[PDB]
Design an enzyme around this catalytic site. Structure first.
Site, PDB file in Angstrom:
ATOM      1  N   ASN A 156     -35.612 -94.599  68.604  1.00  0.00           N
ATOM      2  CA  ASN A 156     -34.532 -94.843  67.672  1.00  0.00           C
ATOM      3  C   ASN A 156     -33.243 -94.069  68.074  1.00  0.00           C
ATOM      4  OD1 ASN A 156     -33.652 -92.609  65.604  1.00  0.00           O
ATOM      5  ND2 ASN A 156     -35.891 -92.298  65.902  1.00  0.00           N
TER       6      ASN A 156
ATOM      7  N   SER B 233     -14.138 -60.652  61.905  1.00  0.00           N
ATOM      8  CA  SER B 233     -15.019 -59.546  62.301  1.00  0.00           C
ATOM      9  C   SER B 233     -16.472 -59.926  62.081  1.00  0.00           C
ATOM     10  CB  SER B 233     -14.730 -58.355  61.420  1.00  0.00           C
ATOM     11  OG  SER B 233     -15.617 -57.274  61.710  1.00  0.00           O
TER      12      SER B 233
ATOM     13  N   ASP C  41     -46.736 -63.129  48.013  1.00  0.00           N
ATOM     14  CA  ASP C  41     -45.575 -63.964  47.612  1.00  0.00           C
ATOM     15  C   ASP C  41     -44.355 -63.524  48.386  1.00  0.00           C
ATOM     16  OD1 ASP C  41     -47.090 -65.424  45.805  1.00  0.00           O
ATOM     17  OD2 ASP C  41     -46.024 -64.630  44.027  1.00  0.00           O
TER      18      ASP C  41
ATOM     19  N   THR D  37     -32.441 -93.668  51.272  1.00  0.00           N
ATOM     20  CA  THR D  37     -32.807 -92.868  50.086  1.00  0.00           C
ATOM     21  C   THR D  37     -32.697 -91.368  50.331  1.00  0.00           C
ATOM     22  OG1 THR D  37     -35.160 -92.855  50.790  1.00  0.00           O
ATOM     23  CG2 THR D  37     -34.452 -94.611  49.222  1.00  0.00           C
TER      24      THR D  37
ATOM     25  N   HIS E 122     -42.579 -92.956  76.001  1.00  0.00           N
ATOM     26  CA  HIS E 122     -42.057 -94.055  75.145  1.00  0.00           C
ATOM     27  C   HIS E 122     -42.012 -95.414  75.863  1.00  0.00           C
ATOM     28  CE1 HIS E 122     -39.979 -91.907  71.457  1.00  0.00           C
ATOM     29  NE2 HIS E 122     -41.225 -91.495  71.622  1.00  0.00           N
TER      30      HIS E 122
ATOM     31  N   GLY F 295     -37.201 -82.770  66.576  1.00  0.00           N
ATOM     32  CA  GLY F 295     -38.012 -83.447  67.597  1.00  0.00           C
ATOM     33  C   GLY F 295     -39.314 -83.993  67.072  1.00  0.00           C
TER      34      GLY F 295
ATOM     35  N   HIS G  81     -31.218 -74.274  56.710  1.00  0.00           N
ATOM     36  CA  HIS G  81     -31.632 -72.924  57.173  1.00  0.00           C
ATOM     37  C   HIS G  81     -30.395 -72.318  57.822  1.00  0.00           C
ATOM     38  CE1 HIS G  81     -34.148 -69.758  58.844  1.00  0.00           C
ATOM     39  NE2 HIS G  81     -35.233 -70.346  58.330  1.00  0.00           N
TER      40      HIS G  81
ATOM     41  N   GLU H 120     -42.850 -91.623  62.259  1.00  0.00           N
ATOM     42  CA  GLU H 120     -42.084 -90.517  62.891  1.00  0.00           C
ATOM     43  C   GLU H 120     -41.100 -91.091  63.895  1.00  0.00           C
ATOM     44  OE1 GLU H 120     -42.052 -89.481  66.225  1.00  0.00           O
ATOM     45  OE2 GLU H 120     -41.313 -87.407  66.021  1.00  0.00           O
TER      46      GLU H 120
END
Ligand SMILES: *[C@@H]1O[C@H](CO)[C@@H](O[C@@H]2O[C@H](CO)[C@@H](O)[C@H](O)[C@H]2NC(C)=O)[C@H](O)[C@H]1NC(C)=O
Ligand SMILES: *[C@@H]1O[C@H](CO)[C@@H](O[C@@H]2O[C@H](CO)[C@@H](O)[C@H](O)[C@H]2NC(C)=O)[C@H](O)[C@H]1NC(C)=O
Ligand SMILES: *[C@@H]1O[C@H](CO)[C@@H](O)[C@H](O)[C@H]1NC(C)=O
Ligand SMILES: *[C@@H]1O[C@H](CO)[C@@H](O)[C@H](O)[C@H]1NC(C)=O
Ligand SMILES: *[C@@H]1O[C@H](CO)[C@@H](O)[C@H](O)[C@H]1NC(C)=O
Ligand SMILES: *[C@@H]1O[C@H](CO)[C@@H](O)[C@H](O)[C@H]1NC(C)=O
Ligand SMILES: *[C@@H]1O[C@H](CO)[C@@H](O)[C@H](O)[C@H]1NC(C)=O
Ligand SMILES: *[C@@H]1O[C@H](CO)[C@@H](O)[C@H](O)[C@H]1NC(C)=O
Ligand SMILES: N[C@@H](Cn1oc(=O)[nH]c1=O)C(=O)O
Ligand SMILES: N[C@@H](Cn1oc(=O)[nH]c1=O)C(=O)O
Ligand SMILES: [Ca+2]
Ligand SMILES: [Ca+2]
Ligand SMILES: [Cl-]
Ligand SMILES: [Cl-]
Ligand SMILES: [Zn+2]
Ligand SMILES: [Zn+2]
Ligand SMILES: [Zn+2]
Ligand SMILES: [Zn+2]
Lengths: 689, 689
Positions: free
Chosen positions: B201, B568, B606, B213, B493, B461, B629, B367
């Site tokens: 893709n 800085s 936790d 979505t 692929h 990936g 992240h 995937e």
């Protein structure tokens, strides 16, 4: 037993002495006196025996009048001669030597000197501007508008006036809204004098906190937006006046008559709309507003009593301490309550008690400038607060009136609130042998159930906002209020909120303020000390059924459009049904938990703690990154009010007037789908497997 | 003991039989064969004794060629006569009766028939387009570009070509990048034949999942974007060809010579750049691409082994099963590994074992179409996954080469990875009495420490992306790889990824695939069964020090601009110092925990579980709501690579060419500030009080 000792130790006379001690001088955010007050609270918490009490500071954008370029409004004639100029006033009786009272202004107003024709816009609500444009033939573009305070948050008025194209907005206190019948003006009674004006900020922050640092705490190193890009800062001047001056401005307004009685206030003027004057030298109105915005240090006091079993779980008791002037009701009545609650928890500690979970006490700064101190500390501490907090209990004004209790809280807390009010004596005359729950039920029954007291939805209005609307921490607010057509209370946000006002007119025995302290303190105690967190999720299920029916009912007038655009509420009702089943099953399992198995108890407590979090969508609501709760948000028309299914409500509101119906109905479908998913996901958090 | 039984029970011969059984027919996402394969995996998991194994479906946008309007590229003369047309091929030997192999195409290509002059753009990397425009005098606007596959994810190439103004992009496999020296083409060896083209893709999803979505699982009721607004869908046609056809297109390119040897591939052509042809009937190139996008049902298989002590804590072992053709390496070698791991956990269960926490096994679909099945299930289950997941271990291809191990994981997992590899025998020739750790260390030492094996940063990936980059769940990937200038492996692929390729050329004994199964399974076992979660946060502290030095070093060439714009890095270094202190203190306290006090153990577990979450910012990165992240993100230039401090890196990249330097440096300051805050907040989660 311990709950009873906590409640019974609190004393009306102690609340009175605290209140007197904190209301002798003004304590505006960012000023030395409000720093001194922070240090006094900190000293007291250490004396009471809290484990910690620290000052936590931020440098945030605040706004103050310029002492050498005073604000005013004027009327000029066609020769540019000033014919009238708004004005000002001495401190209240007994406060003659107080020198630093801030004059009336609206914090964060734009600077400018617009001049133009005047138009009266009623309360400057969305519906008032709709009426002006769609029914009355009035165009506010290029006009200075005058609006009465009341009904909605003042920043919403300013947002509305900007949208309508006004070049300035004058706010005033009409006696219809701030003068109670057959009561004398201060000092003889508790009504608003005609010389007094209501202070308050006019930002549209939508939960952002400090305008310069949305998303992140305003620390020393922190990136700041350029001030011109500060979030929520209005782009037109705004200034407040009292009703003596407003009468002068309104008297000669010409043009159309007021359209109906709901537009006419109580002054001896016609309430014609303008634009322009008739029957007068009165030709144009001018504003002159030059407040200064400046980054200023603010200080929260944050203290703890660490839990003996679950130190990594928190119940927050937070209330602001900054005021506009002396703030004897707002917030200082809540400041005095918070000190008496902390003192009583200290008394329990002195006899060897420690709570199961950790209590965090917080005295917030700069609430009056946009919930700034409480929001910046939520932004700093978000990672621990979102993973560990049980609940947030506010401690702002306790005594906004003397009629009955008003409670606003998440459905998770309804059961605990009703339980605790049954065990606190009513302070009300005539209820001497009855509970607070009994008087509250008599005076304010719920529209959805006549045999329960009314509890309102959470929007905004005080420091719980970021905790509930951004972080999804169960929150509650409780205080005494009025029965009464006036908005807020007459002297709200004026120089006349004095200790003498509260003692003479609101609660001479301090018993009503005591009952509020007992309830706030008992809520914190039960949330922090109960082995099983005292939420009920079936009450949330019932609430969702009500909200789903309400939004579906609002859609009925558009039934043909629903059909034509393939819009259905089926998935929302399906999610609500699934949530009701999951909440029932959860409580069926909860009664079976082995109370002697700590991990079994902790797993189910984590489900109770994390349920409110499930409703928080990190993508936020449209245009509002910092209102993330899918079930509630502050209304886009009035931040003081809570709105249910806000994404759906805002998508359907005024939809018949949207330019593109296909696009508008697709946004309704979007928000229905998000609400169905979010409720289904929340139901998923309760499942056993 | 139990870990040894888990590892020793796994057998190379079982992995071989699984692989053979799953690679007889194509199993493209959305097709009946890949549904049949889901049901086979489900049947097997139930046989193995898992507590549950269910199919979970979504309806997502997929893309396939139109069987009655085949795609091609052509060369026409000035009279519009087609002189050449790209072509196609029989199934591999032994697969002659297989009828539904999908021909080569690039899923989600735009439809169209552009015609124009051809330009060769090397790998279509950002630096290749910079070179073309800034150094070489080439304008790709209005051109069809031809790029070789390799170096970066193909969707990045297409994004780059769109930015450069191309009207179409042809992708091809150059033997420089997909033909290993002195190896024969399939079937005689493992190299790529000149008739074969690489499928894949070409979306630019940036973590969104199903294009229609974003944010929400693609259920039956779910609101969908209009297809024209689908996230990541390119706006120009893209199609892949093999090198025999590319040679024909490249041969007569005229214009400038290749600028240096790094632009010249291995075909017997000049690698001149164009635009246009010389020396030929060859006048213009045309593409004709008419793939169909259609909403199609996909199926994940999701199974569990419920924990006996902490059933509300999860370790996820997930791997995709959809392939482009037979996918014997990608992903089916990982599918076979996952089945053998599940079988071995079932064997432990048969003797009465149950894990402490819950294992979730997942066989993901689609995937190859954008991580769709794994991402939609993360979107569905986000509320439970973000509050309860310990880690995600992937199970995609196990055998991309036969040289050594390659591991990509969060620093939290370094210590466990090194520990476990020391206890698994090396499968490598010559290492018969040594551990996997020993061979890996010899073959791929870390640049930052010569006495540790290399572990790479996580970008994207494969299916771990949403778990780590959106949700902040510690993730790891491990597999065998090459040493070797070719990209991926030659037959990646293509139709030639067959069981016979793997057995004959990659790993005839299946010992290398077995070692990967043992490591993946042992990682899941230790994460799910250890009383104290086996992360080390000091390794994260050391990683942050390295990343801070790296981004500061990248800034040195702009030292004068840092000074002039008041930029800085001090707050970032201060946060890293504070994090290092907090991580040290945390581990000092962790060794003191009372292992017999379940709440003490759960509180510190936790903190270990929630540390990776602290790095997730719900506001996302610029332009990318679904990469959250702050320490890592997939590179904006190549999603396959991880980039550290991505917000800072993207703000400083190519900054000397930004139109407005004041604005550009303010964005650098913004991202430095966000990174400093986020690290300080993460450090705050570790504090005792
Ligand atoms: C509420 O739960 C029900 C039952 O699990 C879900 O019902 C399924 O709905 C889909 C269509 O969305 C059908 O394909 C299935 O046949 C239904 N199963 C039933 C009725 O047993 C329902 O979708 C859930 N609601 C939401 C909003 O997720
Ligand atoms: C790392 O922790 C130190 C120590 O708590 C913080 O240092 C304070 O920094 C501010 C300026 O930002 C000064 O006003 C204080 O005097 C410092 N206190 C010291 C050095 O004891 C530092 O800010 C923290 N870093 C971050 C990024 O939050
Ligand atoms: C206050 O107004 C005076 C008079 O216009 C002006 O000179 C001064 O700069 C103002 N102060 C600030 C902080 O802008
Ligand atoms: C409002 O009045 C202004 C006058 O400048 C004009 O620009 C605008 O189009 C008018 N809108 C309506 C609804 O009358
Ligand atoms: C307080 O209560 C008294 C007794 O009912 C009443 O007369 C008075 O109006 C109330 N005061 C206020 C400020 O509402
Ligand atoms: C496939 O292409 C044929 C020929 O152009 C066309 O008629 C048909 O509509 C296409 N199929 C789809 C699903 O678009
Ligand atoms: C690129 O070429 C196109 C030709 O149409 C032109 O529009 C554009 O300005 C050129 N840019 C450069 C850098 O040459
Ligand atoms: C596999 O290993 C053998 C032995 O080292 C080697 O000759 C061959 O090239 C390797 N195969 C692949 C596909 O890299
Ligand atoms: N409570 C204050 C502060 N104000 O309340 C909000 O909800 N936002 C805000 O600035 C007021 O009403 O002026
Ligand atoms: N692994 C596949 C799928 N692909 O990997 C991503 O990271 N995004 C994406 O679509 C490929 O490389 O084609
Ligand atoms: Ca902030
Ligand atoms: Ca989705
Ligand atoms: Cl309150
Ligand atoms: Cl993998
Ligand atoms: Zn207040
Ligand atoms: Zn106030
Ligand atoms: Zn794969
Ligand atoms: Zn693949």
């Amino acid at each position: 037993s311990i709950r009873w000792k906590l409640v019974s130790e609190m004393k009306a006379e102690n609340i009175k002495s605290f209140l007197r001690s904190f209301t002798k001088l003004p304590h505006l955010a960012g000023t030395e006196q409000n720093f001194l007050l922070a240090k006094k609270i900190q000293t007291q918490w250490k004396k009471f025996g809290l484990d910690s009490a620290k000052l936590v500071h931020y440098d945030v954008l605040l706004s103050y009048p310029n002492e050498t370029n005073a604000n005013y409004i004027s009327i000029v004639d066609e020769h540019e001669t000033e014919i009238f100029k708004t004005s000002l006033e001495p401190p209240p009786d007994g406060y003659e030597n107080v020198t630093n009272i801030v004059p009336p202004y609206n914090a964060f107003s734009a600077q400018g000197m617009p001049e133009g024709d005047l138009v009266y816009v009623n309360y400057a609500r969305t519906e008032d501007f709709f009426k002006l444009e769609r029914e009355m033939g009035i165009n506010c573009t290029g006009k200075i508008v005058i609006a009465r305070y009341g009904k909605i948050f003042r920043g919403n008025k300013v947002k509305n006036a900007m949208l309508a194209g006004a070049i300035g907005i004058i706010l005033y206190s009409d006696p219809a809204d701030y003068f109670a019948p057959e009561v004398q003006p201060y000092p003889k009674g508790w009504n608003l004098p005609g010389t007094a004006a209501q202070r308050g900020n006019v930002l549209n922050l939508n939960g952002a906190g400090d305008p310069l640092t949305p998303g992140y705490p305003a620390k020393e190193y922190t990136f700041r937006l350029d001030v011109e890009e500060g979030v929520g800062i209005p782009r037109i001047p705004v200034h407040p006046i009292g009703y003596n001056d407003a009468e002068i401005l309104l008297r000669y307004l010409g043009g159309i008559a007021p359209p109906d009685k709901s537009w006419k206030g109580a002054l001896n003027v016609s309430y014609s709309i303008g634009p322009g004057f008739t029957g007068s030298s009165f030709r144009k109105v001018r504003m002159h507003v030059y407040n200064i915005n400046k980054i200023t240090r603010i200080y929260n006091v944050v203290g703890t009593i660490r839990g003996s079993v679950e130190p990594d779980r928190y119940v927050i008791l937070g209330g602001h301490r900054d005021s506009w002037v002396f703030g004897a009701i707002d917030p200082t009545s809540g400041v005095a309550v918070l000190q008496e609650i902390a003192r009583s928890f200290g008394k329990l500690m002195s006899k060897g008690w420690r709570p199961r979970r950790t209590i965090i006490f917080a005295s917030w700064d700069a609430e009056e400038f946009g919930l700034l101190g409480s929001t910046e500390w939520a932004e700093e501490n978000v990672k621990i607060l979102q993973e560990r907090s049980i609940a947030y209990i506010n401690s702002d004004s306790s005594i906004e009136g003397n009629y009955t209790l008003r409670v606003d809280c998440t459905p998770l807390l309804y059961q605990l609130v009703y339980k605790l009010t049954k065990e606190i004596p009513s302070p009300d005359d005539g209820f001497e042998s009855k509970s607070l729950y009994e008087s509250w039920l008599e005076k304010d029954p719920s529209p959805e159930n006549k045999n329960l007291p009314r509890i309102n939805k959470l929007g905004s209005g005080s420091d719980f906002e970021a905790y509930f609307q951004r972080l999804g921490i169960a929150s509650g607010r409780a205080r005494y209020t009025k029965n009464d057509k006036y908005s807020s209370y007459p002297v709200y946000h004026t120089i006349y909120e004095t200790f003498e006002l509260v003692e003479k007119f609101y609660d001479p025995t301090f018993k009503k303020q005591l009952s509020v302290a007992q309830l706030r303190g008992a809520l914190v105690y039960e949330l922090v000390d109960s082995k099983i967190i005292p939420f009920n999720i079936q009450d949330y299920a019932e609430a969702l059924k009500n909200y789903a029916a309400s939004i579906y009912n609002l859609s009925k007038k558009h039934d043909q459009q629903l059909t034509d655009h393939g819009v259905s509420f089926d998935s929302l009702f399906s999610a609500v049904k699934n949530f009701s089943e999951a909440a029932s099953d959860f409580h069926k399992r909860l009664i079976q938990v082995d109370l002697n198995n700590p991990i079994a108890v902790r797993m189910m407590n984590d489900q109770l703690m994390l349920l409110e979090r499930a409703f928080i969508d990190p993508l936020g609501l449209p245009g509002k990154l910092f209102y993330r709760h899918i079930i509630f948000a502050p209304s886009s028309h009035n931040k003081y009010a809570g709105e249910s299914f806000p994404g759906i409500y805002d998508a359907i509101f005024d939809i018949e007037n949207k330019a593109n119906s296909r696009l508008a109905w697709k946004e309704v479908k979007k928000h229905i789908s998000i609400a169905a998913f979010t409720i289904q996901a929340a139901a998923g958090t309760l499942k056993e497997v």
